[PDB]
């Protein structure tokens, strides 16, 4: 029981900490004061890091599933 | 009690005043077009916000726009 | 069902009740002080996530229970 | 009325096989996007979509139906096939009891040999649950030289049938008047098709399935049978075993049917041998039956003057209460094709459903009863094909409402009389299901937790607050008292659910008795309430799908659409296909319920091994206990049951452990599609395309994520097919491995 | 003939064609040489 | 041996698996006759069987305790220890497959983009187009280094962005 | 273990994925390149553009947690 | 128009037997529609809430609880009867008000006297970021 009520609530924080962390970039976030730094430099080529966390979890979830499907048969 | 708000992309298609069935959009004159005509939003009140006018625009981003806000009997649509 | 049926179904439905109850003999001089319709689209992801995942809860804590207590090992 | 053909319309070339997209206007310029190839395979066989013209609607349609009869056919004659070549027929109809039946032997690649078990007849292989081998014998076929050239018979009329479907299209192909020439379709189809189908199929089961099921049933070696062709020959060999043949037609033609008595009986019941109906009593009525429909043929007025004129059949039954009524059908029902697949649908899927309750009770083909598995694979299969039949009438009707409904035919008509009190309609029947849901529903909890807090006598139960259904029992004695009094020519009854005395074959009960008690209440009543409440989600669509308060110009938007917006609160799933996608669900739901009430009855009050003392059913009669509380259906049925599945690794039945794995993956994956909407996929695809467009590899077609329709229609797609292949699976595992 | 050629390069058509190829070539590969796990 | 494995021959547990799966299939054999062809099937299937568990065996496998086989991944280990097969060996077979399928679909991709309607060139294919890439890509590690050293296998923001 | 652990990585990733997504792509998308003038929750943007269903940076929170459970499951 | 044309509340209605789509009591209490054409013959047409109904020759009337119901009708019969309609809004003072013609022209037609409104002279995007306006309302405006 209490393993699994500190892991149930690990992934709720873990899950409010990104979704408070959105708003962020929509109520709090101006562009011009943070021009140039780290946080501009991520939000401008997001388009690769969405890109290598889609690759990772499809090589991922195709490799885990076949070797539970090989076995199965 | 939705907000209706034209920018200044229009072109005088007139496919948005076709479109709205309740006629909360017209077409008034304007010299910054070839067609020499822009859209208007006079009577919002009456919008049911179905954002059907949105899909009418042919632009390459949406020179209409209609952002949701607060609800009211005409805006949700209730016969009762 | 917040998940699969979406609201355009019951807003349709509760229109045909709200006919009958001001059709009905005796029902009509009751009248509601505020008007009856359905829940929003946003308000329904809410509420089917949370009989989701209270479902997901409360179904494994009497599994976990259960099993370790009724063999107590 | 006449004939009508139009000569060579349409040339026949694979021009049009190369441009694809060529029946739409819109799908003729060509793809820019990949949903021009969704949009393709959907709008393919929606022929009135395509052109307005009525006439060409029909020649599509009458030539499309002569494809699916050549598919058919090539199927039917795989099984002959298949059943001739690679199957134990031979080794079965020597001893049906012990051995069991296999049409599909497998390849020996890695693994898989072990599905070919060890059947029983020198023979391993697949065991099917399709009944053909009872059907073949219930026929006069002893050997596999009969079920070949059977095979080769349905090519060749399956190429025929192809042939006429390019004949019947491309080179001669009838006119709009042939096609609305309706009362010439009943006489031919109703004494034609349905009356000489039957007058023939009396024939050879008088002079086949007779003469050879009777010497079958003597113990007689098949090999030893004289041969089906052998018996129309000679008069005197059949003779001997029914005398009335030596008379030869003379008391037909005299009216001294009373010498046939031979052949033609009413005995009713079942044979003792067998397990299945008299076949002499099935002559009888096929016999009957083709009469009947001889005559109704005979009805329609078609061309020599005189007979009924279904118009002045239908503006001529009036009333008060309905005012102008039945009048404008008949331009509705000869001008739209959807008019009349829906009704026939209606009838079509309720028809299968009456098949599955109608076989079981009266099993009619020999050994049917004692293969279990057989006897509850026919009857869970029709029924799926009727909820299916059903709800396409449903969906088949709104199109009409949308597409080929005109208000001016229709003034004060029923069908205007019925929109207008459309309202009176959904509030009445939305009570109905909320009286049934409580007060079926409602019932099974009271029991639980009855149970849970240890006041067992306050449940309902046999040894409780039974609620017993007295109309039910009431008709099962008058039914079973009738011999006596209503039909005295009758020997016995229809069936033994009725009542009466066991019936065993070879160790195992064929049928008894069935007892109706206080769980057969609850479980008829639930039904009833799934059934009203899947009639209310399809009604609603039909009745607003044209309009309603909310929106008041759905026709213009048409049949499928998503979402008029997120205006009004939100209009999404208002149309009448998402009112299909949702009825779906439901009828799926009622369907499955219906199935897992005829397994545990069955298993538990019917079937089992007769010993000396009494019969020892399967699950130990449990069902008069359990059933009453929820959780009995989830210990006793399914923790139970399931212990055949979960341990067939290893096996011959190891398929049907991995099909109840597939199929709870392919239910889940749906809700992927179910739960979310075409939004968040689309950006995702955006920053898909930048790594492809990064590299120089990227599609000229744009991806484009699933259309919320599609979107929609893939999720009940992938979840019905998980939902009912699981139970295909959780059946046949739990019994062909018997108990 | 030009146009039963097009038909045949259609995108249904083409991935049949490599779907007996690669399954045949794989199914005729556990055939011979039976069930491989470790490459020599 | 490595990581407390026991090589599969000297394994207990690994000889028992067979004896007992061939015992299923000698009591299976029991039913039939000896010249029927259910009998020959389930002979060949015993013949395999014996084959499967020697020809492991023989390949220097490591088998746990309860008896079935395990593969080691770490290179170092599987030089060391000779079981390069099991793993290492597959990634470098897999990658030049994997790698041939890229290299191919990449240049169909490009060379119908340069003529008039791509579009249709993915839907109707060019088949001798298609046929002659296919056995041209034996060598696509080559390429792709050519490529890359040249400059031309990635393009340079021209690409759509969004804010 | 090998198997079990494999399987929790591809849980991790996709969830980060499917959050990390609605938060960079929450000032706005090619779909929708004004995400920020509306807010963090809304309905959708209307059947237009092919469909604009589940696109706020809440649908993605959203379709997390079904994930974040079978993770932690 | 050349003058707003006021409302006569007594001309004959179509030739319809009643549905359960009409009037409910939000119209006695807060407000209704009503919908005037003038038809040169005898035609059938389909009512937005039921079915089908006669038209009469003459001017023609309707009650609607919603404008939509309303200029779902005038759609249908601009395009297949081409005619013109006028529509009013009703509330439960007696109050009158002359809506969808305001100008005697339908809006999909330019015209002199109109003035715009809610016409922001940019272009779509191009607009200040929400931190701007963090503590009042309105983004856009
Ligand atoms: C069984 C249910 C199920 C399954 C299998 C999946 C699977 C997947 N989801 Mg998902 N999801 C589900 C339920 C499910 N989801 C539910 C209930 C929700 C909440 C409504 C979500 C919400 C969700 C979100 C928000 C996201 C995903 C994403 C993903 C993908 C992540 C990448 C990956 O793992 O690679 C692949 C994993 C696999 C298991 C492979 C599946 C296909 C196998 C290999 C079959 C191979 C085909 C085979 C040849 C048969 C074909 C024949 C047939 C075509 C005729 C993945 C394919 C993420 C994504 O987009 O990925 C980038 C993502 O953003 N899901
Ligand atoms: C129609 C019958 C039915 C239905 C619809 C359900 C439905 C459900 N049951 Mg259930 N159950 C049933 C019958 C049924 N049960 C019966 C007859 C029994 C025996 C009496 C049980 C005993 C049972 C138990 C003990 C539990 C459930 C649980 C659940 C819930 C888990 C849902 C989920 O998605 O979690 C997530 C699903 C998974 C994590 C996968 C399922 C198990 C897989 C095989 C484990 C794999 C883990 C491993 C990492 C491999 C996966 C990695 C992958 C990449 C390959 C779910 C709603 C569980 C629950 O309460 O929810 C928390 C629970 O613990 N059921
Ligand atoms: C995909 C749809 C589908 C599929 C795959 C099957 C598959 C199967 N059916 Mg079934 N059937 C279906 C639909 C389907 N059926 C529907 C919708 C009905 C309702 C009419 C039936 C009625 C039916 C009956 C009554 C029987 C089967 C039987 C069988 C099994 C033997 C196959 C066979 O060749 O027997 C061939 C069937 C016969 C030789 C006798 C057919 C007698 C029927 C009453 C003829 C009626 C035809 C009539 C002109 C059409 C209806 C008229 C209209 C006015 C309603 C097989 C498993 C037989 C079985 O149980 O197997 C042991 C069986 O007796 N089917
Ligand atoms: C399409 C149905 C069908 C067909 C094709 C046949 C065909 C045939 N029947 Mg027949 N028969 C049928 C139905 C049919 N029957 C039915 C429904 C009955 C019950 C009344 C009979 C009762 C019957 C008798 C009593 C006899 C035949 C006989 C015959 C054969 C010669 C008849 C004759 O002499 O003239 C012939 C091949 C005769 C025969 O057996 O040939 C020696 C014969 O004596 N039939
Ligand atoms: C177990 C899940 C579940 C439940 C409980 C329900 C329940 C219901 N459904 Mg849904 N259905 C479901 C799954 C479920 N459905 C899913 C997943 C889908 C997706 C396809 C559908 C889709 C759907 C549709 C489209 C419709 C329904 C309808 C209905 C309602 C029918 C009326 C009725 O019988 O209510 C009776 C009440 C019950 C059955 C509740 C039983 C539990 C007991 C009786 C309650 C005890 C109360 C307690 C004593 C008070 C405690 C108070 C406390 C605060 C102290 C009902 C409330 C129909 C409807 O609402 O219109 C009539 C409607 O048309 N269903
Ligand atoms: C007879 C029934 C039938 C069936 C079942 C299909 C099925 C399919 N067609 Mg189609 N087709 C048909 C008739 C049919 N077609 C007819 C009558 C025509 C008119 C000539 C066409 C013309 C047509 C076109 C123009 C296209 C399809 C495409 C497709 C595929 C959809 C793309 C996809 O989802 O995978 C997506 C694939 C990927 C994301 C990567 C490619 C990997 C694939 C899956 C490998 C190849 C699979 C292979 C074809 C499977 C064997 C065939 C299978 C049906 C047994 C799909 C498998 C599309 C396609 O590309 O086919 C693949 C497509 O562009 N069809
Ligand atoms: C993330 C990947 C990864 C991980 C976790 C390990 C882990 C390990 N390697 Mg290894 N290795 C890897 C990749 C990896 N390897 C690759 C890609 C190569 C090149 C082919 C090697 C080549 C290699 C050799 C040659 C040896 C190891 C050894 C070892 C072990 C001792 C610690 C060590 O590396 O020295 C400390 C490293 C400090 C940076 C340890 C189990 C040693 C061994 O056998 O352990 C007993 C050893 O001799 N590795
Ligand atoms: C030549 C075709 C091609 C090529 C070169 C690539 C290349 C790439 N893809 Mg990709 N992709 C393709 C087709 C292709 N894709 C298709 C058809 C689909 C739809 C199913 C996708 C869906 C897809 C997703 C969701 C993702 C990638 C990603 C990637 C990148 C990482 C590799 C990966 O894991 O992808 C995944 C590999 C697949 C999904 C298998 C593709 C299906 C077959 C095997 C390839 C198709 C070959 C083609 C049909 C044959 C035509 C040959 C011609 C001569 C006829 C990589 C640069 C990932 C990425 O973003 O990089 C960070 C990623 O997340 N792809
Ligand atoms: C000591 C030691 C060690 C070390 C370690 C290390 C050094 C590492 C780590 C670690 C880590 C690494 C941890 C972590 C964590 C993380 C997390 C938890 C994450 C994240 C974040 C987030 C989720 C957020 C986001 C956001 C947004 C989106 C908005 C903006 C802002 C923010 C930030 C809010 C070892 C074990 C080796 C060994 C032994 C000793
Ligand atoms: C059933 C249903 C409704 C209608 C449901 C209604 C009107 C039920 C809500 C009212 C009842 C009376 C509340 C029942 C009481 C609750 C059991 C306890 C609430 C406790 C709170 C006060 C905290 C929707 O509005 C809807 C909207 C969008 C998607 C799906 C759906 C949906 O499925
Ligand atoms: S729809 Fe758009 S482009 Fe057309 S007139 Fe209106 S604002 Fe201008
Ligand atoms: S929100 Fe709807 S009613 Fe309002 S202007 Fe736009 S399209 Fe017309
Ligand atoms: S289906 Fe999607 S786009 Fe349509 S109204 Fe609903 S949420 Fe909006």
């Given at each position: ?6 892991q ?15 708003i ?38 195709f ?11 | 009690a939705?907000v ?9 298609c ?8 309740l ?32 899909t ?7 020179s ?10 005409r ?6 | 069902?917040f ?27 009751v009248?509601?002080?505020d ?17 989701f ?19 107590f090992? | 009325?006449?004939i009508?053909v ?14 694809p ?9 060509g793809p ?12 393919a ?32 004659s795989?099984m002959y ?9 031979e ?14 032997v ?12 060890d ?21 006069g ?19 025929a ?30 004494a ?15 002079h ?5 099921n ?6 007689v ?9 052998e018996?129309?020959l000679?008069?005197?060999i ?38 299945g109906?008299?076949?002499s ?34 503006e ?16 509705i029902?000869?001008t ?28 009619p ?12 694979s ?7 094909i009727?909820?299916?039949?059903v ?9 009409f ?8 035919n ?7 009389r019925?929109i207008?009190?459309?309202d ?7 009570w109905?299901s909320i ?5 079926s ?8 937790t ?5 006041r067992?006598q306050?449940?309902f ?7 017993q ?6 008709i099962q ?21 009725w ?8 160790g195992?009960?064929?049928?008894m ?12 009543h ?20 044209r309009?309603s ?11 499928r659409?998503?979402?008029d ?21 439901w ?16 298993q ?27 959780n009995?259906?989830?210990?006793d049925?399914?923790?139970?049951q399931?212990?055949?599945?979960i341990?067939?690794?290893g ?16 239910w889940?994956?749906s809700?992927?599609?179910?739960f ?19 590299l ?23 979840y ?14 739990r019994?062909?491995?018997?108990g | 003939?030009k ?28 055939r011979?040489?039976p069930?491989?796990?470790?490459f020599? | ?17 067979e004896?007992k ?28 069987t ?6 492991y ?24 220890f ?6 290492f060996?597959?990634?470098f ?9 890229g290299?191919?679909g ?6 119908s ?5 791509p ?15 296919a ?11 050519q490529?890359?050293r ?14 | ?13 996709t ?8 938060a960079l792509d929450?000032?706005?998308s090619?779909?929708?390149p004004?995400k920020?003038?509306?807010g ?24 997390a ?7 932690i499951? | ?6 409302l ?19 119209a ?21 809430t039921?079915?089908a109904a ?21 759609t249908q ?16 003072d ?5 809506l969808?013609?305001?100008d ?38």
């Open positions: 029981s209490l393993y699994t009520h500190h149930y609530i690990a992934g709720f924080i873990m899950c409010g900490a990104f979704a408070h962390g959105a962020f970039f929509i109520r709090d976030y101006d562009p011009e004061q943070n021009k140039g730094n780290v946080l501009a430099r991520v939000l401008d080529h997001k388009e690769a890091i969405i890109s290598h966390l889609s690759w990772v979890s499809l090589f991922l979830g490799h885990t599933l076949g070797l539970y499907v090989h076995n199965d048969v | 939705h209706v708000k034209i920018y200044d992309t229009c072109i005088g007139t496919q948005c005043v076709r479109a709205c069935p006629d909360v959009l017209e077409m008034v004159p304007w010299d910054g077009c070839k067609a020499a005509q822009m859209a208007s939003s006079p009577r919002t009140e009456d919008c049911v916000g179905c954002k059907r006018c949105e009418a625009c042919p632009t390459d981003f949406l209409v726009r209609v952002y949701l806000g607060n609800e009211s009997t805006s949700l649509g209730l016969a009762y | 069902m998940l699969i049926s979406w609201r355009g179904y019951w807003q349709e439905l509760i229109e045909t009740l709200v006919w009958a109850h001001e059709k009905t003999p005796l029902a009509n001089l009248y509601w002080k008007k009856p319709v359905a829940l929003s689209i946003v308000q329904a992801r809410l509420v089917g996530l949370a009989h995942s209270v479902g997901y809860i409360f179904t494994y804590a009497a599994f976990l229970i259960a099993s370790t207590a009724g063999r090992g | 009325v006449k009508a139009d000569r060579n319309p349409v040339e026949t070339n694979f021009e049009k096989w190369a441009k997209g060529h029946f739409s206007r819109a799908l003729a310029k820019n996007t990949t949903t021009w190839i969704w949009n393709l395979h959907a709008d066989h929606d022929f009135d979509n395509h052109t307005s013209d009525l006439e060409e609607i029909s020649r599509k349609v009458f030539s499309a139906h002569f494809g699916q009869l050549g598919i058919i056919l090539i199927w039917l795989g096939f298949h059943g001739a070549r690679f199957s134990n027929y080794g079965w109809l020597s001893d049906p009891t012990h051995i069991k039946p296999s049409a599909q497998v390849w020996p690649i890695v693994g898989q040999e072990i599905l070919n078990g059947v029983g007849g020198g023979f391993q292989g697949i065991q099917i649950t399709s009944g053909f081998f009872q059907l073949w014998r219930a026929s076929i002893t050997s596999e030289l009969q079920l070949y050239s059977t095979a080769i018979g349905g090519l060749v009329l399956a190429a049938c192809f042939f006429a479907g390019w004949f019947h299209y491309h080179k001669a192909a009838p006119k709009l008047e042939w096609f609305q020439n309706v009362e010439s379709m009943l006489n031919h189809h109703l034609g098709l349905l009356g000489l189908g039957s007058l023939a199929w009396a024939g050879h089961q008088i086949v399935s007779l003469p050879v009777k010497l079958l049933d003597a113990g070696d098949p090999k030893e049978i004289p041969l089906p062709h018996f129309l000679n008069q005197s059949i003779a001997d075993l029914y005398p009335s043949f030596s008379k030869g037609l003379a008391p037909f033609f005299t009216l001294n049917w009373a010498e046939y008595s031979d052949f033609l009986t009413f005995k009713g019941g079942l044979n003792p041998v067998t397990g109906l008299w076949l009593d099935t002559a009888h009525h096929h016999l009957a039956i083709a009469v009947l429909f001889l005559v109704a043929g005979h009805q329609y007025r078609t061309n020599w003057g005189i007979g009924h004129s279904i118009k002045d059949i239908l001529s039954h009036k009333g008060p209460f309905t005012g102008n009524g039945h009048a404008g059908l008949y331009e029902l000869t739209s094709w959807h008019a009349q697949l829906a009704i026939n649908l209606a009838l079509f899927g309720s028809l299968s459903i009456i098949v599955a309750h109608h076989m079981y009770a009266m099993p083909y020999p050994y049917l009863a004692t293969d279990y598995g057989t006897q509850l026919l009857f869970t299969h029709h029924m799926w009727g909820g299916f039949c709800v396409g009438a449903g969906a088949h009707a709104a199109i409402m949308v597409r080929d409904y005109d208000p001016t229709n003034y004060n008509n029923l069908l205007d019925v207008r009190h459309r009176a309609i959904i509030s009445h029947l939305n109905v009286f049934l849901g409580f007060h529903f409602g019932l099974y909890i009271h029991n639980d009855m149970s849970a807090l240890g067992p306050d449940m139960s046999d040894t409780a607050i039974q609620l259904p007295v109309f039910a029992q009431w004695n008058t039914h079973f008292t009738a011999p006596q009094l209503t039909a005295p020519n009758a020997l016995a009854a229809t069936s033994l659910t009542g009466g005395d066991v019936v065993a074959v070879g195992k009960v064929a049928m008795p069935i007892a109706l008690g206080t769980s057969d209440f609850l479980v008829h639930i039904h009833a309430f799934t059934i009203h409440v899947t009639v209310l989600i399809l009604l609603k669509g039909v009745l607003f799908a309009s308060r909310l929106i008041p110009d759905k026709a213009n938007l048409g049949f659409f998503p979402c917006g997120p205006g009004r609160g939100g209009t999404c799933q208002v149309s009448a296909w998402d009112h299909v996608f949702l009825g779906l669900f009828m799926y739901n009622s369907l499955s319920i219906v199935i897992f009430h005829f397994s545990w009855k069955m538990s009050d019917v079937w089992g091994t007769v010993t000396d003392s009494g019969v020892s059913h399967i699950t130990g009669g449990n069902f008069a206990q359990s059933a009453n509380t929820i009995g259906w989830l210990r049925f399914l923790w139970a399931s212990s055949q599945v341990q067939s690794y096996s011959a039945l190891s398929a049907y452990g991995l099909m109840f794995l597939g199929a709870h993956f392919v889940a994956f809700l992927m599609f179910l979310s909407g075409r939004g968040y996929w689309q950006e995702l695809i955006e920053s898909i395309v930048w790594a492809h467009n990064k120089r590899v990227a599609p000229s077609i744009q991806p484009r994520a699933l259309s919320i329709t599609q979107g929609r229609a893939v999720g009940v797609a992938h019905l097919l998980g939902g009912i292949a699981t139970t295909w699976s959780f059946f046949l595992a019994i062909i491995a018997v | 003939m146009d039963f050629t097009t038909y045949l390069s259609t995108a249904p058509v083409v991935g049949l064609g490599w779907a007996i190829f690669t399954s045949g070539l794989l199914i005729e590969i556990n011979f040489f069930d491989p796990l470790v020599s | 041996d490595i990581a407390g494995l026991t090589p599969c021959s000297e394994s207990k547990a690994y000889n028992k698996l004896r799966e061939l015992k299923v299939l000698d009591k299976r054999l029991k039913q039939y006759e000896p010249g029927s062809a259910p009998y020959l099937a389930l002979q060949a299937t015993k013949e395999r014996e084959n499967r568990f020697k020809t065996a023989k390949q220097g496998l490591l088998c746990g305790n309860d008896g079935l086989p395990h593969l080691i991944s770490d290179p170092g280990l599987a030089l060391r000779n079981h390069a097969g099991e793993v060996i597959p990634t077979g897999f990658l030049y497959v994997a790698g041939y399928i290299h191919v990449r240049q169909y991709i490009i060379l983009k340069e003529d008039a309607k579009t249709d060139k993915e839907i109707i294919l060019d088949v001798p187009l298609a046929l002659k890439l056995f041209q890509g034996w060598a696509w590690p080559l390429a792709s280094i490529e890359l040249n400059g031309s296998l990635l393009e340079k923001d021209e690409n759509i962005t969004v804010s | 273990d090998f198997l079990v652990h494999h399987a929790i990585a591809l849980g991790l990733h969830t980060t994925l499917i959050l990390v997504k609605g929450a000032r706005g090619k779909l929708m004004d920020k003038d509306f963090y929750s809304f309905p959708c943007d209307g059947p237009g553009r092919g469909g604009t269903c589940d696109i706020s940076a809440y649908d993605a929170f959203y379709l947690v079904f994930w974040m459970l079978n993770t499951g | 128009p050349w003058k707003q044309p006021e006569d509340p007594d001309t004959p209605s179509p030739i319809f037997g009643g549905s359960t789509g009409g009037l409910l009591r939000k006695q209490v807060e407000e209704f529609y009503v919908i005037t054409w003038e038809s040169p013959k005898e035609q059938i047409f389909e009512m937005p039921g079915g006669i038209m009469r020759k003459g001017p023609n009337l309707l009650k609607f609880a919603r404008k939509e119901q309303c200029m779902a009708l005038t019969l601009r395009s297949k009867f081409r005619q013109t309609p006028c529509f009013y809004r009703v509330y439960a007696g109050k009158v008000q002359y969808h013609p305001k005697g022209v339908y809006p999909e037609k330019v015209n002199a006297g109109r003035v715009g409104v809610n016409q922001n002279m940019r272009s779509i995007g191009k607009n200040v970021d929400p931190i701007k306006v963090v503590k009042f309302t309105g983004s856009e405006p």
